[PDB]
Design an enzyme around this catalytic site. Structure first.
Site, PDB file in Angstrom:
ATOM      1  N   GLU A   1       0.751  -1.246   0.000  1.00 50.15           N
ATOM      2  CA  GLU A   1       0.000   0.000   0.000  1.00 50.15           C
ATOM      3  C   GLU A   1       0.782   1.298   0.000  1.00 50.15           C
ATOM      4  O   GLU A   1       0.229   2.399  -0.225  1.00 50.15           O
ATOM      5  CB  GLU A   1      -0.823  -0.036   1.303  1.00 50.15           C
ATOM      6  CG  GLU A   1      -1.620  -1.345   1.383  1.00 50.15           C
ATOM      7  CD  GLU A   1      -3.045  -1.046   1.172  1.00 50.15           C
ATOM      8  OE1 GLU A   1      -3.386   0.104   0.973  1.00 50.15           O
ATOM      9  OE2 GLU A   1      -3.844  -2.104   1.264  1.00 50.15           O
TER      10      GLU A   1
ATOM     11  N   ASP B   1      -6.482   7.626  -4.615  1.00 53.17           N
ATOM     12  CA  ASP B   1      -6.007   6.345  -5.149  1.00 53.17           C
ATOM     13  C   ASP B   1      -6.542   6.055  -6.566  1.00 53.17           C
ATOM     14  O   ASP B   1      -7.271   6.867  -7.177  1.00 53.17           O
ATOM     15  CB  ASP B   1      -6.428   5.189  -4.235  1.00 53.17           C
ATOM     16  CG  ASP B   1      -7.915   5.150  -3.966  1.00 53.17           C
ATOM     17  OD1 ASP B   1      -8.676   6.011  -4.350  1.00 53.17           O
ATOM     18  OD2 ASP B   1      -8.304   4.097  -3.275  1.00 53.17           O
TER      19      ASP B   1
ATOM     20  N   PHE C   1      -8.355  -6.495   5.021  1.00 54.76           N
ATOM     21  CA  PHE C   1      -7.797  -5.136   5.170  1.00 54.76           C
ATOM     22  C   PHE C   1      -8.116  -4.257   3.963  1.00 54.76           C
ATOM     23  O   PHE C   1      -8.490  -3.093   4.043  1.00 54.76           O
ATOM     24  CB  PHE C   1      -6.254  -5.182   5.380  1.00 54.76           C
ATOM     25  CG  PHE C   1      -5.624  -3.814   5.399  1.00 54.76           C
ATOM     26  CD1 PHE C   1      -5.280  -3.152   4.216  1.00 54.76           C
ATOM     27  CD2 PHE C   1      -5.331  -3.181   6.605  1.00 54.76           C
ATOM     28  CE1 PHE C   1      -4.665  -1.894   4.228  1.00 54.76           C
ATOM     29  CE2 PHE C   1      -4.733  -1.919   6.647  1.00 54.76           C
ATOM     30  CZ  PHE C   1      -4.403  -1.276   5.453  1.00 54.76           C
TER      31      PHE C   1
ATOM     32  N   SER D   1     -14.670 -19.909  -2.722  1.00 55.45           N
ATOM     33  CA  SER D   1     -13.233 -19.832  -2.543  1.00 55.45           C
ATOM     34  C   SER D   1     -12.868 -19.954  -1.083  1.00 55.45           C
ATOM     35  O   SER D   1     -11.857 -20.537  -0.719  1.00 55.45           O
ATOM     36  CB  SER D   1     -12.548 -18.662  -3.263  1.00 55.45           C
ATOM     37  OG  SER D   1     -13.411 -18.128  -4.267  1.00 55.45           O
TER      38      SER D   1
ATOM     39  N   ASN E   1      -9.667 -19.957  -8.565  1.00 49.57           N
ATOM     40  CA  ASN E   1     -11.011 -19.443  -8.325  1.00 49.57           C
ATOM     41  C   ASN E   1     -11.014 -17.938  -8.123  1.00 49.57           C
ATOM     42  O   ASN E   1     -11.806 -17.217  -8.725  1.00 49.57           O
ATOM     43  CB  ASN E   1     -11.668 -20.136  -7.125  1.00 49.57           C
ATOM     44  CG  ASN E   1     -13.174 -20.143  -7.203  1.00 49.57           C
ATOM     45  OD1 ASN E   1     -13.852 -19.663  -6.275  1.00 49.57           O
ATOM     46  ND2 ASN E   1     -13.701 -20.697  -8.302  1.00 49.57           N
TER      47      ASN E   1
END
Ligand SMILES: [Cl-]
Length: 164
Positions: free
Chosen positions: A11, A20, A104, A117, A132
């Site tokens: 990040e 972003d 997160f 999944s 997947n």
């Protein structure tokens, strides 16, 4: 090497409010400002979470505090989530780390949504799940990071993050 290290790389750091790829305003280490419009707006919010007129600029430590909070928050959601908890309890560290990373970045209720999944990791069916996830908007949204997070799940090792 842990989750903190892992997300640092995933990040980056920023000490002055920014927007972003996704459009949203961000600061610190991928700590987003679930705020609409104007930077001002963004700022107020910031100021709020920080408890000071910030002018969209924060200190390293203030960035560290947010990071800690957000992570604890990722973890706390998994721990209280009936759908995620079993899975978590099931993986190996590294694999837990990968789990966190997703919560997160995308939220507990977003993760809880990869029904099948989730099942596959839970049944130690790495590649299948690996593959997947590879469809998914998620993956599709951030290919390099997912790639990284997916490989981790796949191999159960820190290779994807190795030297950086
Ligand atoms: Cl942060």
């Amino acid at each position: 090497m842990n989750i903190f290290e892992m997300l640092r790389i995933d990040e980056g750091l920023r000490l002055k409010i920014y927007k972003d790829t996704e459009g949203y305003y961000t600061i610190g280490i991928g700590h987003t400002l679930k705020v609409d419009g104007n930077s001002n707006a963004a700022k107020s919010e910031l100021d709020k979470a920080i408890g000071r007129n910030t002018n969209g600029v924060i200190t390293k430590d203030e960035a560290e505090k947010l990071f800690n909070q957000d992570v604890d928050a990722a973890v706390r959601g998994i721990l209280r989530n009936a759908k995620l908890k079993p899975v978590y309890d099931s993986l190996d560290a590294v694999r837990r780390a990968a789990l966190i990373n997703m919560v997160f970045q995308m939220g507990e209720t977003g993760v809880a949504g990869f029904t099948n999944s989730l099942r596959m990791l839970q049944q130690k069916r790495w590649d299948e799940a690996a593959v997947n996830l590879a469809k998914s908007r998620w993956y599709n949204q951030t290919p390099n990071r997912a790639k990284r997070v997916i490989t981790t799940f796949r191999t159960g090792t820190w290779d994807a993050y190795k030297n950086l």
